């Protein structure tokens, strides 16, 4: 579904961002 | 003026403020730049609550009969609170819970009522954001999904619901909400709504993960995009066929309703929702500024933008309202032309709007019997412009229908839902601030644990509470928060903030404090409003608010396909149990203020 696939893409980039951000904090030492 | 002993111990010394900015570089957050703070204040005083509520209340009272009271109470009750919150935060270097607890230990209740209010308005606005995302996810389709109706098992009959209503009305109520016929009919969870709610909460967490370390970079796109896109839509809205019809319609208010206490009460309560006053985010955010930051100039700049943006968004809505009403007038007109052309077989194009009533008579005289069966419509445009929209219709019914009638309809749908999504987000950063900072200041989670852990659990907790608005009967629940239940607490907190800063902390100390921070005592404008105007107005509005708004029987609007005059409005009475919910949602926060104060003056004994 177009809405589903757009949703998935948005979720993916958002969760990836979250993961990068949390990891960035782990990097901050 | 009220006896407050030990105040000087609890609060930072005036001389200690000069030796705090360069030695508290750690432990406390700092704005990287004044721009970050100004963009955060912009997003919280001109997010949703301004841009979402104001236009609805304009068209639910009168286009211009509501802006007058709104702009009066913005100046006389809003600017004063905005300055007060900015200054008190900047002075006492703490959040809402830290600030009121340090002015007097019995006022920790004021800070707990702001955290709960902030919780509840966050829960409301993030459901609106989940709907906005549903519509943004369906905006990548050349024929927008709300432009057409579904068929029947015969794949030859349009769905009766859509047929009786519209493609848009059906996409809102059936394809999005899957709404039930009353609040008592709970049904179950709409999985596709649940996926949108998770998306809303998850994006919010990505932006608020390290408070202002992360939200201060987010605001560079989140508080700048909405204003440019709202400028583009202003142009497109003005270039509409009937745009000016609505623009003239909000600047010719009926004055008979300028004398209606409901117009004053809604404007009263809108001033606190517009600025995000009495939530406590503003106090926390101003507490991260330099002690020598000009908070007076900031409050005035934010205010001017708040008023200007309120009137601007009303122009963008009414240009689209005017466009819808004019395409109805025309449509209705073109069908009254087509009834007598089909009845008297006149040449097409012979009968026009210019020559219609004459033709009606010329034809009536020719064959009155053959004119009698010709049912017509009585459709003046002032009857179309003044047709109020219940609920969230302005966003998901009026603006969505009008975008389909525009060319490149998918590019205007994506811009519209991206604008609203960023406004939602900017507003959600303030509301999250107002829940996270108090829970940090209640030392409830292990200090060792990173804030990231606390932020995450608030997002999960509130996400789980928001499953009630994913039900078949969710909208009905969200419309209870739209009741006076969502407002009484805000009016009580705002009054108590004003009173406690002026009479419990002392306005005289507060003036010496501001004079230290910005270099001049606040002028006679602030003095009059802070000591009499704002306080008296807040008390009056609270008193009369119960006199009518609260006294009136709580009713709501149900979407029942099985109802006579079906696509028309059937308001019913909420069940008795629902009223109990309104009491707890509005009472608990309000009663937290005295409740905690009475607890503290019986522990002392
Ligand atoms: O539907 C809207 C806003 C729509 C809108 C706003 C701005 C724009 C812009 F022009 F900016 F694009 C376009 C649409 N508001 C509903 C509302 O506030 N309530 C609360 C009280 N009662 C209710 O039930 C519903
Ligand atoms: C809508 O609600 C009804 C009643 O709860 C349910 O049977 C149906 O599966 C739901 N889904 C859709 C797509 O309407």
mmCIF file of C-alpha atoms in Angstrom, chain A residues 1-4 6-8 10-11 13-26 28, chain B residues 133-134 136-138 140-141 191-192 195-196 198-199 202-207 209-210 213-214 452:
data_model
loop_
_atom_site.group_PDB
_atom_site.id
_atom_site.type_symbol
_atom_site.label_atom_id
_atom_site.label_comp_id
_atom_site.label_asym_id
_atom_site.label_seq_id
_atom_site.Cartn_x
_atom_site.Cartn_y
_atom_site.Cartn_z
ATOM 1 C CA UNK A 1 0.000 0.000 0.000
ATOM 2 C CA UNK A 2 1.310 3.507 -0.929
ATOM 3 C CA UNK A 3 0.360 4.860 2.565
ATOM 4 C CA UNK A 4 1.872 1.704 4.157
ATOM 5 C CA UNK A 6 5.472 5.704 2.785
ATOM 6 C CA UNK A 7 4.716 4.937 6.500
ATOM 7 C CA UNK A 8 7.374 2.144 6.467
ATOM 8 C CA UNK A 10 9.237 7.237 7.390
ATOM 9 C CA UNK A 11 9.322 4.727 10.330
ATOM 10 C CA UNK A 13 14.406 6.609 8.719
ATOM 11 C CA UNK A 14 12.932 7.754 12.105
ATOM 12 C CA UNK A 15 13.959 4.542 13.986
ATOM 13 C CA UNK A 16 17.375 4.613 12.187
ATOM 14 C CA UNK A 17 17.704 8.274 13.337
ATOM 15 C CA UNK A 18 16.739 7.207 16.919
ATOM 16 C CA UNK A 19 19.327 4.339 16.782
ATOM 17 C CA UNK A 20 22.023 6.729 15.386
ATOM 18 C CA UNK A 21 21.086 9.368 18.045
ATOM 19 C CA UNK A 22 21.224 6.873 21.008
ATOM 20 C CA UNK A 23 24.507 5.451 19.549
ATOM 21 C CA UNK A 24 25.820 9.054 19.162
ATOM 22 C CA UNK A 25 25.240 9.496 22.948
ATOM 23 C CA UNK A 26 27.053 6.185 23.593
ATOM 24 C CA UNK A 28 29.868 10.770 23.631
ATOM 25 C CA UNK B 133 0.050 11.425 9.446
ATOM 26 C CA UNK B 134 -2.724 9.039 8.218
ATOM 27 C CA UNK B 136 -0.042 12.564 4.843
ATOM 28 C CA UNK B 137 0.567 8.802 4.133
ATOM 29 C CA UNK B 138 -2.510 8.741 1.750
ATOM 30 C CA UNK B 140 1.138 10.175 -2.552
ATOM 31 C CA UNK B 141 -1.679 9.046 -5.011
ATOM 32 C CA UNK B 191 -4.950 -1.353 13.542
ATOM 33 C CA UNK B 192 -4.137 1.245 10.785
ATOM 34 C CA UNK B 195 0.253 2.234 13.288
ATOM 35 C CA UNK B 196 -0.208 6.019 12.810
ATOM 36 C CA UNK B 198 3.054 4.650 16.980
ATOM 37 C CA UNK B 199 4.571 6.694 14.101
ATOM 38 C CA UNK B 202 8.181 7.502 17.667
ATOM 39 C CA UNK B 203 9.016 10.680 15.629
ATOM 40 C CA UNK B 204 8.405 12.811 18.762
ATOM 41 C CA UNK B 205 10.853 10.580 20.721
ATOM 42 C CA UNK B 206 13.533 10.891 17.942
ATOM 43 C CA UNK B 207 13.273 14.757 18.344
ATOM 44 C CA UNK B 209 15.414 12.105 23.113
ATOM 45 C CA UNK B 210 17.954 14.500 24.822
ATOM 46 C CA UNK B 213 20.146 19.120 23.011
ATOM 47 C CA UNK B 214 17.957 17.476 20.297
ATOM 48 C CA UNK B 452 16.718 9.104 27.199
#
